[PDB]
Design a protein around this nucleic acid. Structure first.
Lengths: 57, 57, 57, 57
DNA sequence: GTTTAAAGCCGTTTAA
DNA sequence: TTAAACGGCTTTAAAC
DNA sequence: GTTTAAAGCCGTTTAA
DNA sequence: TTAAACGGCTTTAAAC
DNA sequence: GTTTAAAGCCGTTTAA
DNA sequence: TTAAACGGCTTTAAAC
DNA sequence: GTTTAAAGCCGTTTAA
DNA sequence: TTAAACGGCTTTAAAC
């Protein structure tokens, strides 16, 4: 499964909050991103829609 | 706040699951991504750590 | 805000997974329950509905 | 799996926000509650701890 | 001094 | 047209 | 929380 | 031309 | 032995 | 009609 | 990823 | 009686 996140920007934002990022952290976030998207598609379908809206996530 | 998402890849993945993406869907996903990261940093800090782990998300 | 969770059953389930429950853990879970419900009501409303469905959470 | 939710209080809270509750809504919320708890126990374990904290959820 | 792991730089190449 | 990834190298830190 | 039964809504289709 | 029926769903109440 | 915090019991009372 | 909360008491464990 | 412009869909309302 | 217009939304493509 392809990375859906911009690693550099995630690391830069986390650094901005005063934290380092583990070697495998971004991979972990990517996995949570996929689950959010999959949950959203179940909500889209439940509302008899073909188009994912911000409200579905 | 910068986009943390690869828009093209998210739209392509959603399309692969048989769905269209609204004009404002990606912005909505971005907002949820930020909340997940902010939740994670509270977890990192609660564990007296300076480094975000995949388990924190 | 009232407790929406059955504390005894939460502690018993967590114990069944081989874990103890902190003095303030249940309060923390209650807070996450409220956020889930509030997110769901935003989804219900976005779908022009008056009735919360399982799919909204 | 036992209900972890106080149904009456959830229905009353949702009603307070101006919404009805579907016949199967509470069951749906229960399922999300279990996933939150299971996520938390993975976080507890990742922190080499035996006791679930509010921060783990 | 050692180990472990994370940051920071630099240059090149797709990818977005 | 532009930035993000990437992979090698060195730095840096913590703790023993 | 449960059961039982009645009300109240909504949308469609005859029936009056 | 119009309202009454109807059937599914949720609410509500009482009492244990 | 001490401290800190969590479990486990018991009995009563609403609450669900 | 039933179980969950609750508050006091003792146990238990970890680490110093 | 961005911009520009064209296609394709869907639902409603005249127009032919 | 029927289809063409129309206007919003998303997709798609090309090239930089």
């Amino acid at each position: 499964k392809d990375t859906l996140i911009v690693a550099s920007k995630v690391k830069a934002y986390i650094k901005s909050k005063g934290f380092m990022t583990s070697g495998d952290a971004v991979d972990g976030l990517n996995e949570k991103l996929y689950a959010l998207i999959d949950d959203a598609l179940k909500r889209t379908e439940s509302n008899k829609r073909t188009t994912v809206r911000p409200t579905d996530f």
